């Protein structure tokens, strides 16, 4: 039978959270002038022989009240914490996202993957070693992705599913 995994994608505005989610779900690359409106998306996919239903919240509108977001924070099982490899501030923001997740879940062992997106770009300002060190300090995996080329996209979300399975019976 199907197993449901509730996933939440968080990170600074403009890092490519909608692009990653839409790449995964709809298999095309978005490049929109307009800022993302928060929404959730479902994907059915076989991961390691298990038929999975991924219920994914692409967070956005980060200053505003969202009933749906509150519910995903309550029930969400794993988090993608996304920065952009050409934006040092988005990387510096990761700690605040991680600390918020830890506070709201009241736990240090929440399934999480650190994602460095936009890895297709020639304008890197965050070294892979800095990101690996941060992820090691949190005890979580680090993966680079490009929503533009699809590099690493499936890997990031499937790794998160595998992290959830490592933490709890599914």
């Amino acid at each position: 039978s199907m197993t449901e995994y509730k996933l939440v994608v968080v990170g600074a505005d403009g890092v490519g959270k909608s692009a990653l989610t839409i790449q995964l779900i709809q298999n095309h690359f978005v490049d929109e002038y307009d800022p993302t409106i928060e929404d959730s998306y479902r994907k059915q996919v076989v991961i390691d022989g298990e038929t999975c239903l991924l219920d994914i919240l692409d967070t956005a509108g980060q200053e505003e009240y969202s009933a749906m977001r509150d519910q995903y924070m309550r029930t969400g099982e794993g988090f993608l914490c996304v920065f952009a490899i050409n934006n040092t501030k988005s990387f510096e923001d990761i700690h605040h996202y991680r600390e918020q997740i830890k506070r709201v879940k009241d736990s240090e062992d929440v399934p999480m993957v650190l994602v460095g997106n936009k890895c297709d770009l020639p304008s890197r300002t965050v070294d892979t070693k800095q990101a690996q060190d941060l992820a090691r300090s949190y005890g979580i995996p680090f993966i680079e992705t490009s929503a533009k080329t699809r590099q690493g996209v499936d890997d990031a979300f499937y790794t998160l599913v595998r992290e959830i399975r490592k933490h709890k019976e599914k």
Binding site: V10, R69, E99, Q100
Partner: peptide
């Protein structure tokens, strides 16, 4: 806005305060 509430969550006590 508090740097420690990067994503507004209504039941996070940090988010409900304003500086």
């Amino acid at each position: 806005r508090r740097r420690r509430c990067p994503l507004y969550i209504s039941y996070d006590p940090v988010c409900r305060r304003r500086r």
